[PDB]
């Protein structure tokens, strides 16, 4: 043990020091939010502001990380390992940021997603405040219970994605599909004008989506496209008007096929399985309570 | 009992053998997912790959079904009947698949939906892993409790579908419908220019849907169309912008009719009955717990 | 008491007779569903079929209503009043239907919504089957508890509808509205080409909805329009893309107004209040259990 | 204490007087709802009606506020402070309204949002009726428990908004973006016609939204735009067809980026965090029960 280490240690564990560090964490988070609010451009109007505020915050985080480590003999293996390596990683990337700010492009342009890690320093606040800590610990000790029902959900979604690629991956590939009227039986026309060529019992509908694809290719063109589509249907997003109904009405008389596909999926997965997953989640949380 | 049956039996019931069979099940499922991901085309690029991997997996499933069946004395009536006939059906269709791969089109082109049953072999994993087994057994012992509230839900949806076919099956049949302004009272025009022919208090709106139909035919043309539409409304999917609002504003002054139709349905079928159905489901599951 | 009334009474209360009446109820319901499925047209193809099946079902319902009443001395005040007057009303309208089928237009064309009451005979099944009876009684004894939170919900929605008519009833009244770019600061243009007249920092967007209106007239033109719009937002239907976002981006710099309007409404009403209403509903049901 | 103050006090606390005040509150609320229903225009048709009904209601509220205050010696500090200052504020704005109705534009045109406060007089009814009072008190004593999970939700949404502004603030800035086909492998074309110039493996799709923007500027152009967009995704509204899918398919092969962005956000925030927030809300309410 270093000579003056005990007092630096229990001083870093002071309520006032931890509250000041929380103030610093929150103000850095707000500085980043404010950078995105008032200078999200590529040609930033105030680049030095964000650059040097970043420098100052990273400096203070480095300094009080060193104050953190001096109390544990720079080991950080024994005491509070997980949070300490999280702090070490975030301040290592912050010192990397100071190096980028000072002395050249030592980081390649392929690793900017590590420069985006500043937003996650706010997770250190979940260590300072006991309430957020209590909630995230409950979440973490509940996720393993979710695991089983989640993998059942994923297996069923994967079965449906396989079937969806088999059935619908070529729906509307021409760019158009045909739908069928009952114009005669609905009085909107006579059989004579249908046989004459004045009206028709079918309509050619464009199959192209907003994103430029045809209906089959966009939604069920591949397995991961179909899996994404089934996640979207699992959330209820436009599952009928954009996904289900084109397939349902593209089938002249076999409409029970797509109808039963989507209805069975919605029922099983959405209603039953999502509610079981969330029920297990909340049960494990409330006996974490 | 056959001479060397006992040891084959308790060997097939080995934890290691069942885990190896689970590995085979999962890897076959992943092989099918990967086929749909990397070769969903009709003109496949690697057709022999999928064909012969299918052959190999079906062979191993046949072999260890025979090892299974040795243990039950090919009886499979007495021990674990349900899973055994599920395995028998899936490997029978797999041997049918081997026959299609080897020696001709002995299956007619009408029964390809039986060739699609490979995706469901993954359900055998729910027998190997005790957690997925415990979840699916809870689901199955909860469904009969859902039954009653489900049939009440279906009866109410069927009443609404009858009424919807009666009311809205001809809405917008001309392809267009008329809506009504308050342009004069809203200052956007004078009564003089309305009487003159310069502006108007009504607008002709097209009723055609994205699927080539007019609004009434597409949603309430028949009873099963209306039932599908009410399932879509039950979920909350585009129930106003595509379904409710055209009917609501097609009524000049009788707008309370469609408004009350859809609001009552949502309030009854979607705010109250869905939550009772899911509540019964989860109650039966949690006392399955 | 009439002479042979006791035995007719306890015979109508026979399990077999009530099950046969339930079969008749369900088959009449299915006959109506099938009429809407296979003959929803105005010019029906099999009109005599529906007409005479209606006649036959109404006849049998009349007959076993008379058998019902002979057991209670035709009083139906003392024994099972509510169900008995429901049966009396439905068979009175059914005899009215027989009269329409036989001998002229004694009903005016204003009262066809009473001819639509046949769909509601299926509610008599909820008397025959004890499970559906047990569920609808729980629903009915739970609704009065919902009452309070429901009226709070309605008051808050009405406040928001008043404010919405005040703020947004004239948004986009010209048929178009203006939105504002950051094209210069986003590098998409220079200040010189903005001042020159080559590009612009504002765009004119059309405000017309799919129903022919403009945004404000159609969503907040009157109080009941705004109340309907807030019910739609309360369900989550297209509340941003069709409703919230035009108002949010029509405000050049005052975007916090509409944003806070919709965000506060969604939060309060949709999350908090809907979940409290449904929680009270399900609590009263589960202690009805 | 004033001489005849005791009897005025316990007379204002009479059940009949409080019920008459509740009748007045509800009828004023209905008068405002009816004003918005039957005269929402700027050029009102019956302006004197609303003006003088407003005058009369404000007069009666002033009068019985004075009757309220005479019983507490005009102090209103000691007895029922919160409701009394709410009444004082609402009737102060109502007397301000009487002054606007009588004698000139003493209020500047910047403070009309204070003239809109009449809709909130109905909150005084929550004091008269003990059931609504019991519900709003439960809501208020539950909100502080929601606080923690709410701020966690907001932090995570803010992280996602920062990342969304970084990634997607320039998506489709040209007004168009490019998507990529598999037309050759899907048999819809040959490689020869792709190399010839007859068909193509990419499509140019327009990025402009319904509000005149481009995708990135409109959904993630700034931090508060991205935060609003993520609130929309949390609700589940058009999160795929308008938001997620353009970003997902704009990425040629990096589609896992946007897919994982939106899928992780939906899962974490929507499912887990919204359900934990509502669970805490309802728990605090039911032990407020």
């Amino acid at each position: 043990w270093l000579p003056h280490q005990r007092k630096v240690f229990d001083f870093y564990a002071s309520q006032g020091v931890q509250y000041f560090t929380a103030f610093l964490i929150v103000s850095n988070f707000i500085f980043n939010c404010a950078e995105k609010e008032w200078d999200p451009y590529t040609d930033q109007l105030y680049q030095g502001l964000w650059r040097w505020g970043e420098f100052a915050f990273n400096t203070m985080f480095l300094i009080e990380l060193l104050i953190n480590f001096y109390g544990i003999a720079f080991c950080f293996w024994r005491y509070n390992w997980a949070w300490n390596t999280f702090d070490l990683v975030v301040v290592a990337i912050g010192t990397l940021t100071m190096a980028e700010a000072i002395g050249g492009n030592f980081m390649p342009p392929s690793m900017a997603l590590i420069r985006n890690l500043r937003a996650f320093r706010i997770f250190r606040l979940f260590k300072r405040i006991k309430s957020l800590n209590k909630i995230i610990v409950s979440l973490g000790k509940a996720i393993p219970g979710v695991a089983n029902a989640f993998v059942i959900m994923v297996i069923i979604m994967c079965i449906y994605a396989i079937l969806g690629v088999e059935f619908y991956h070529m729906t509307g590939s021409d760019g158009t599909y045909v739908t069928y009227n009952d114009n005669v039986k609905r009085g909107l026309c006579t059989g004579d004008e249908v046989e004459l060529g004045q009206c028709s019992l079918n309509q050619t509908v464009s199959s192209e989506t907003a994103r430029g694809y045809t209906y089959g290719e966009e939604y069920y063109g591949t397995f991961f496209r179909a899996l994404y589509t089934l996640f979207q249907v699992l959330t209820g997003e436009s599952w009928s008007e954009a996904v289900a109904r084109p397939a349902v009405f593209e089938s002249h008389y076999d409409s029970f096929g797509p109808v039963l596909f989507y209805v069975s999926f919605i029922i099983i997965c959405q209603i039953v399985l999502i509610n079981v997953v969330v029920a297990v989640l909340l049960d494990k949380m409330v006996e974490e309570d | 009992w056959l001479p060397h049956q006992r040891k084959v039996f308790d060997f097939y019931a080995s934890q290691g053998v069942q885990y190896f069979t689970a590995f085979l099940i999962v890897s076959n499922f992943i092989f099918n997912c990967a086929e749909k991901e990397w070769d969903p085309y009709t003109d496949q690029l690697y057709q022999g790959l999928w064909r012969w991997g299918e052959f190999a997996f079906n062979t191993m499933f046949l072999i260890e079904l025979l090892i299974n069946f040795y243990g039950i004395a090919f009886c499979f009536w007495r021990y674990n009947w349900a899973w055994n006939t599920f395995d028998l059906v899936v490997v029978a269709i797999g041997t049918l698949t081997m026959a299609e791969a080897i020696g001709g089109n002995f299956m007619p082109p009408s029964m390809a939906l039986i060739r699609n049953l490979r995706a469901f072999r993954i359900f055998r994993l729910f027998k190997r892993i005790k957690s997925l087994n415990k979840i699916i057994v809870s689901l199955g012992k909860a469904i009969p409790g859902v039954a009653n509230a489900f049939v009440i839900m279906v009866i109410i949806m069927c009443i609404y579908a009858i009424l919807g076919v009666e009311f809205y099956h001809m809405t917008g049949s001309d392809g267009t419908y008329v809506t009504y302004n308050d342009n004069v009272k809203r200052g956007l025009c004078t009564g003089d220019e309305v009487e003159l022919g310069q502006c108007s208090l009504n607008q002709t709106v097209s009723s055609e849907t994205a699927r080539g139909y007019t609004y009434g035919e597409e949603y309430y043309g028949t009873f099963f169309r209306a039932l599908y539409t009410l399932f879509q409304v039950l979920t909350g999917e585009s129930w106003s912008e595509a379904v409710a609002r055209p009917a609501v504003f097609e009524s000049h002054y009788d707008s309370f009719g469609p408004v009350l139709f859809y609001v009552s349905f949502i309030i009854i079928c979607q705010i109250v009955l869905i939550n009772v159905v899911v509540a019964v489901l989860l109650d039966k599951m949690v006392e399955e717990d | 008491w009439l002479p042979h009334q006791r035995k007719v009474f306890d015979f109508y209360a026979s399990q077999g007779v009530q099950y046969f009446t339930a079969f008749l109820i369900v088959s009449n319901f299915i006959f109506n569903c099938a009429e809407k499925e296979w003959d929803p047209y105005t010019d029906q193809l099999y009109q005599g079929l529906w007409r005479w099946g209606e006649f036959a079902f109404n006849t049998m319902f009349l007959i076993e209503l008379l058998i019902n009443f002979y057991g209670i001395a035709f009083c139906f005040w003392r024994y099972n009043w509510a169900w008995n007057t429901f049966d009396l009303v439905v068979v009175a309208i059914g005899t009215l239907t027989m009269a329409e089928a036989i001998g002229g237009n004694f009903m005016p064309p204003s009262m066809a919504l009473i001819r639509n009451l046949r769909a509601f005979r299926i509610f008599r099944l909820f008397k025959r089957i004890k499970s559906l009876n047990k569920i609808i009684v729980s629903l009915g004894k739970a609704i009065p508890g919902v009452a309070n939170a429901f009226v709070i919900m309605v008051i808050i929605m009405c406040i928001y509808a008043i404010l919405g008519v005040e703020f947004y009833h004239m948004t986009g009244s010209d048929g178009t509205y203006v939105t504002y770019n950051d094209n210069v600061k986003r590098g998409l243009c220079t200040g010189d080409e903005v001042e020159l007249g080559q590009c612009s920092l504002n765009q004119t967007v059309s405000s017309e909805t799919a129903r022919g209106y403009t945004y404000g007239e159609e969503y907040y033109g009157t109080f009941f329009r705004a109340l309907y719009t807030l019910f739609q937002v309360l369900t989550g239907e297209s509340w941003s893309e069709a409703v919230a976002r035009p108002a949010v981006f029509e405000s050049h710099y005052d975007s916090f107004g509409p944003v806070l309007f919709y965000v506060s409404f969604i939060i309060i009403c949709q999350i908090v209040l809907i979940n409290v209403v449904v929680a009270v509903l399900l609590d009263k049901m589960v202690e009805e259990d | 204490w004033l001489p005849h103050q005791r009897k005025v006090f316990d007379f204002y606390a009479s059940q009949g007087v409080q019920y008459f005040t509740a009748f007045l509150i509800v009828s004023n609320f209905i008068f405002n709802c009816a004003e918005k229903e039957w005269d929402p225009y700027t050029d009102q048709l019956y302006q004197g009606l609303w003006r003088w009904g407003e005058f009369a209601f404000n007069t009666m509220f002033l009068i019985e506020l004075l009757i309220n205050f005479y019983g507490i010696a005009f102090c209103f500090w000691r007895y029922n402070w919160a409701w009394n200052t709410f009444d004082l504020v609402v009737v102060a704005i109502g007397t301000l309204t009487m002054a606007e109705a009588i004698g000139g534009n003493f209020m500047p045109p910047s403070m009309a949002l204070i003239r809109n406060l009449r809709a909130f007089r109905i909150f005084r009814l929550f004091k008269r009726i003990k059931s609504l009072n019991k519900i709003i008190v439960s809501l208020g004593k539950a909100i502080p428990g929601v606080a923690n999970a709410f701020v966690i939700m907001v932090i995570i949404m803010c992280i996602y908004a920062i990342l969304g502004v970084e990634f997607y603030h320039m998506t489709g800035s040209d007004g168009t973006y490019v998507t990529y086909n598999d037309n050759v492998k899907r048999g819809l074309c040959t490689g020869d016609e792709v190399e010839l110039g007859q068909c193509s493996l990419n499509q140019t799709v327009s990025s402009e939204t319904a509000r005149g923007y481009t995708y990135g500027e409109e959904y993630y152009g700034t931090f508060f735009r991205a935060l609003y967009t993520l609130f929309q995704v949390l609700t589940g509204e058009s999160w795929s067809e308008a938001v997620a899918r353009p970003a997902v398919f704009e990425s040629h092969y990096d589609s896992f980026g946007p897919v994982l962005f939106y899928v992780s956000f939906i899962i974490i925030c929507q499912i887990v965090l919204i359900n934990v927030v509502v669970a805490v809300l309802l728990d605090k309410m039911v032990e407020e029960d």
Partner: peptide
Amino acid sequence: IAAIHNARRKKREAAAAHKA
């Protein structure tokens, strides 16, 4: 909310059984 309502109910009977 049905998922939420049952989670709450789950604790209610757990407390009821604890007293009983």
